[PDB]
Design a protein around this ligand. Structure first.
Ligand SMILES: O=P(O)(O)O[C@@]1(CF)O[C@H](CO)[C@@H](O)[C@H](O)[C@H]1O
Ligand SMILES: [Mg+2]
Length: 448
């Protein structure tokens, strides 16, 4: 066996059998052997065990001669930002993001907040931790507390012209994660009126775990928007590296359409830039990037692949349909804060509602949304789909699973890299009927 908590992109497991303070301390020791010279930034989310897991991680790091910069209770993107800003050797965010309350985990980065993933150091760390039976050493390095968010807040605000912002009314739903702390620190500098839902950090999660995809968290944001006549609503997951938008009618906006929207917003500030996008849903992003003078760059989905493609291309912005938005000036890292600041600026400057900014795009490229399948035999199921459509001779692309372009419609079908599931995405050229019949047809073949 191997330690189950070590996944493709991060560490995540149930406390205390899959992850605990002893493992966390051993991970700190193993991490110190993987990084270049320098201190290590540590931060944590609102979960009840997160401070103790961070303290054990710090004890292992300092036993191995690493200075620790403790940035405290924060979002995942603040570990990214400070690791790069403070020119640290690496950083660790203690978080389970959006998972149940008996779970925790870690997200690990090296210099410039470059991700540490299964094939780029994480499984080396796993195997070291798995074999480590050494007595815990004592600290030969210090911990400094640096909770000042000023540089982070100034960086977030640098993405918008504050003199162009209008006093929009914005619903904000932290889900009792950590997003509300940053909202409240930004608010004195912004003209918006905030309608705060589930705002207080509470790792007991009295209102449900912080996953805005659950229709119950979704309904709380939508109800707040409609009941207050808000311009739009924003919800985050627990560590707020993901943000989700609700228009003025309470309608949840499919993340696909935010990629094209944000790309156009960014390309207005950085003309001619490259924009990285994933292969699941593409046509709208390609068109909107090109219309704004940008250059679209196809990349396999998954944050390590997006970030690495962005670096190699000097891309100004990258976006995934799964509510991950990455920014070159932000150490090529994802933020759940920059996106809504950019959208609020767009609404303020254009005089258009978020609903109408995306309405015509949704009509032009309707999509199924991501549909997940747990089947007995994924490989045979995929083969059944491809054999069925073979006689239509689609254009096939293997960047990330299978992409099949039939002309007026296309689909992407891939295996998940974080769960054992098939994921389906379908889109069409302005044809909702074709979208439904092809989506149902593929769903039937997969389930066969
Ligand atoms: O499909 P997954 O399981 O492979 O990966 C997912 C699941 F949300 O998580 C990755 C990192 O958070 C994202 O970067 C993917 O875009 C996203 O889809
Ligand atoms: Mg998250």
């Amino acid at each position: 066996m191997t330690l189950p908590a070590f996944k493709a992109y991060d560490i995540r497991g149930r406390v205390p059998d899959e992850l605990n303070e002893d493992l966390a301390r051993r991970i700190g020791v193993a991490l110190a052997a993987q990084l270049d010279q320098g201190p290590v930034v540590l931060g944590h989310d609102v979960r009840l065990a997160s401070p103790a897991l961070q303290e054990a991680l710090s004890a292992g790091l300092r036993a191995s001669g690493r200075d620790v910069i403790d940035i405290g209770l924060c979002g995942t993107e603040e570990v990214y930002f400070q690791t790069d800003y403070l020119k640290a050797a690496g950083g660790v965010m203690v978080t389970a993001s959006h998972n149940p309350m008996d779970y925790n985990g870690m997200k690990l980065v090296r210099e410039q907040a470059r991700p540490i993933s299964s094939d780029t150091g994480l499984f080396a760390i796993r195997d070291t931790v798995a074999a480590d039976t050494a007595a815990p050493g004592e600290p030969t390095a210090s911990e400094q507390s640096r909770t000042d968010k000023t540089a982070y807040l100034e960086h977030l605000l640098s993405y918008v012209d504050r003199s162009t912002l209008k006093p929009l009314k914005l619903v904000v739903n932290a889900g009792n994660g950590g997003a509300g702390l940053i909202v409240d620190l930004l608010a004195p500098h912004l003209p918006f009126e905030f309608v705060r839902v589930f705002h207080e950090p509470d790792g007991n999660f009295p209102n449900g775990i912080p996953n805005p995809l659950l229709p119950e968290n979704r309904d709380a944001t939508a109800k707040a928007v409609k009941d207050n006549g808000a311009d739009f609503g924003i919800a985050w997951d627990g560590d707020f590296d993901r943000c989700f938008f609700f228009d003025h009618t309470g309608r949840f906006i499919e993340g696909y359409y935010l990629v094209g929207l944000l790309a156009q917003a960014i390309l207005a500030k950085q003309p001619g830039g490259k924009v990285v996008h994933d292969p699941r849903l593409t046509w709208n992003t390609v068109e909107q990037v090109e219309e704004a003078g940008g250059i679209p760059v196809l990349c396999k989905s998954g944050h390590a692949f997006i970030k690495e493609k962005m670096r190699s291309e000097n891309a100004v912005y990258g976006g995934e349909m799964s509510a991950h938005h990455y920014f070159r000036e932000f150490a090529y890292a994802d933020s759940g804060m920059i996106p809504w600041l950019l959208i609020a600026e767009l609404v303020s400057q254009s005089g258009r509602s978020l609903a109408d900014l995306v309405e015509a795009r949704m009509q032009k490229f309707p999509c199924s949304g991501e549909i997940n399948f747990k089947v007995a035999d994924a490989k045979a199921s995929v083969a059944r789909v491809m054999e069925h459509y073979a006689s239509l001779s689609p254009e096939l692309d293997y960047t990330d699973g299978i992409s099949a372009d039939f002309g007026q419609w296309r689909f992407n079908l891939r295996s998940s890299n974080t769960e054992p599931l098939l994921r389906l995405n379908v889109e069409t050229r302005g044809d909702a009927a074709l979208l439904e019949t092809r989506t149902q047809e593929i769903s039937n073949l997969l389930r066969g």
